[PDB]
């Protein structure tokens, strides 16, 4: 088969920047190359086919390039000036023989530092009837993605009983959000009083703590 190798694995650029992504076929594929954009949770959307022809609806900032020869193996996708909605993974695909895709390039947007807004949520009474308590710490609309979130219960540092999830980069403001979820037994939750999440992030001059006291108005 004919194999496709894409470069780079990941690319970070700011809004307005020029972007180039490349693809190499293991042997000549002439102009039989397509480029796709994929957003998380969605099907790929074709951008370019026949190596340089834009598909309907595709904005003019996208273009495709190669040497114009039947022996071609090397292809480039260019975004002339990056827009916030361009955050996505991009794939090449040949159709010179059995279709094969490249491994993808994840395009991330660089933007100005934004500190998280931090919120904390106690477990619901409904959940406590089941024997478990989840405490949730939300870090909303921040940049860059790296953040540290530490849990304390009656000011004792917790380890091993929390999990994090981070959203896809937002296609309008290029920020991330993050949840940290602390799981306790009902007994452990009822026995302690103060629940705190401590957040460290580039945009915060010092770490922020959000806390609540079990059973407070």
């Amino acid at each position: 088969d004919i194999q496709m190798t894409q470069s780079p694995s990941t690319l970070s650029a700011s809004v307005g920047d020029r972007v180039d992504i490349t693809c190499r076929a293991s042997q000549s594929i002439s102009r039989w190359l397509a480029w796709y954009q994929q957003k998380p949770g969605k099907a790929p959307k074709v951008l370019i086919y026949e190596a340089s022809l834009l598909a309907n609806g595709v904005p003019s900032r996208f273009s495709g390039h190669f040497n114009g020869r039947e022996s071609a193996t090397d292809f480039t996708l260019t975004i002339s000036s990056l827009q916030p909605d361009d955050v996505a993974t991009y794939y090449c695909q040949h159709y010179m023989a059995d279709p094969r895709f490249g491994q993808g390039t994840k395009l991330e947007i660089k933007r100005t530092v934004a500190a998280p807004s931090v919120f904390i949520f106690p477990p619901s009474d409904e959940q406590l009837k089941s024997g478990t308590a989840s405490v949730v710490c939300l870090l909303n609309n921040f940049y860059p993605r790296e953040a540290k979130v530490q849990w304390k219960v009656d000011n004792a540092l917790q380890s091993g009983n929390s999990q994090e999830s981070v959203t896809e980069q937002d296609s309008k403001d290029s920020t991330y959000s993050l949840s940290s979820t602390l799981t306790l037994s009902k007994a452990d939750y009822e026995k302690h009083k103060v629940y705190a999440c401590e957040v460290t992030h580039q945009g915060l001059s010092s770490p922020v703590t959000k806390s609540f006291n079990r059973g407070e108005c």
Binding site: P44, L138, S177
Partner: protein
């Protein structure tokens, strides 16, 4: 108005057969081949094979020992069967419009179905618990409040979350699901709103876990 819609069971035990169907609207199947393509975290996008309106097929040799495809032109539908699944077959499966008869080299994919998530696992289907993430003063900021819903202990993926039956979309963040130590998924969906509205606006998270046919409408109130 040309569109592909697909469906089929998304939880399989190892050694079972995957079966998916795709339906085409706005045109007939004539004039193109129709493909199945899957995406897995470890192997990326993989083309499985293709079929035309007469039922002629061509399969990726890596799947030829296990795959079948059929077409029902009276319904403008086509189908995929993959036998003897293993964990390597977990992934998102898409149908797509492929090459046009009028152009020999045209096997790119201009129209795609929405995808079906397929999970190969020994674990059983389980619907979610849905709990409020209640707004409080420990969840407010300069006139903005956050609230949400915790969607916990379900299997397999996916779940969908809407707010106020779809009327509320601004400021919503639904987190990617994470497998808990239990082996069940959990996620939260949150939204920021004017703290001025907690007084008077109803906030309902509408959770649909189609794998278990579970639906929950959870009202999220200040405590």
């Amino acid at each position: 108005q040309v569109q592909l819609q697909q469906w089929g069971a998304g939880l399989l035990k190892p050694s079972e057969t995957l079966s998916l169907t795709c339906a085409l609207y706005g045109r007939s199947l004539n004039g193109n081949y129709w493909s199945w393509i899957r995406q897995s975290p470890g192997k990326g996008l993989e083309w499985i094979g293709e079929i035309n309106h007469s039922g002629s097929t061509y399969f990726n040799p890596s799947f030829k020992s296990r795959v079948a495809m059929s077409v029902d032109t009276s319904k403008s539908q086509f189908s995929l069967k993959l036998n003897s699944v293993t964990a390597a077959d977990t992934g998102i499966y898409f149908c797509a419009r492929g090459k046009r008869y009028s152009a020999s080299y045209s096997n790119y994919f201009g129209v795609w179905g929405q995808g079906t998530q397929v999970t190969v696992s020994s674990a059983s289907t389980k619907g979610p618990s849905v709990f409020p993430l209640a707004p409080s003063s420990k969840s407010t900021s300069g006139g903005t409040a956050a609230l949400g819903c915790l969607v916990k202990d379900y299997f397999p993926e996916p779940v969908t979350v809407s707010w106020n039956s779809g009327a509320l979309t601004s400021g919503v963040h639904t987190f990617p699901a994470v497998l808990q130590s239990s082996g069940l998924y959990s996620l939260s969906s949150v939204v920021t709103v004017p703290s001025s509205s907690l007084g008077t606006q109803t906030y309902i998270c509408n959770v649909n876990h189609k794998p278990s046919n579970t639906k929950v409408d959870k009202k999220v109130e200040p405590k």
